[PDB]
Amino acid sequence: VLSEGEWQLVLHVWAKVEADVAGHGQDILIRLFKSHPETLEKFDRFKHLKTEAEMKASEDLKKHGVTVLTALGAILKKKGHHEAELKPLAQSHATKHKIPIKYLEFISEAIIHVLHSRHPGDFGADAQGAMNKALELFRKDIAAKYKELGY
Numbered sequence: 001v002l003s004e005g006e007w008q009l010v011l012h013v014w015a016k017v018e019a020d021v022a023g024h025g026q027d028i029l030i031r032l033f034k035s036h037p038e039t040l041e042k043f044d045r046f047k048h049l050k051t052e053a054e055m056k057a058s059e060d061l062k063k064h065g066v067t068v069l070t071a072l073g074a075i076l077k078k079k080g081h082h083e084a085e086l087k088p089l090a091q092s093h094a095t096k097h098k099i100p101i102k103y104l105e106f107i108s109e110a111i112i113h114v115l116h117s118r119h120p121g122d123f124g125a126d127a128q129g130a131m132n133k134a135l136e137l138f139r140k141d142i143a144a145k146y147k148e149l150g151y
């Protein structure tokens, strides 16, 4: 359970992300796919991409990065009271897309890394710890839905 102080640190840096949702989404997906190539393989839309330059040149990838970060932002702004937002996401990711929780840990690492690169003055250790907590909460609550579904 995040404190109010922790949520403030999370949403302070998130408001910086929302000035360039698309650029952040590209940086995060590419870091994910480079660092953990099994994740790329889960996307029929993207598994043709073989180099970082190809990934950076894909408009479809950029579009999906906006979808991802828009969903995550809506969850973060609920400060934990995110049950309604997680239901559809956990159902699609468990049952349709077949995304292990571990891959959710991998994208959380990518988010944290890109936030540090883009927003160091608003992403010192206190804010890094708070964002880690927020993304852990996200994962914990998705994992419980996965367990219900048998995934």
Ligand code: HEM
Binding pocket: 038, 039, 040, 042, 043, 044, 045, 067, 068, 069, 071, 072, 088, 089, 092, 093, 097, 099, 103, 104, 107
């Ligand atoms: C912050 C974590 C994530 C968020 C907020 C997120 C959000 C979304 C949203 C909003 C969609 C479209 C609606 C839906 O199908 O539910 C989607 C689709 C999808 N996601 Fe995620 N996602 C996350 C992480 C991941 C990860 C780590 C993987 C893969 C390793 C992944 C794989 C997929 C796939 C394969 C689709 C369908 C893409 C398509 O073919 O159009 N997601 N995601």
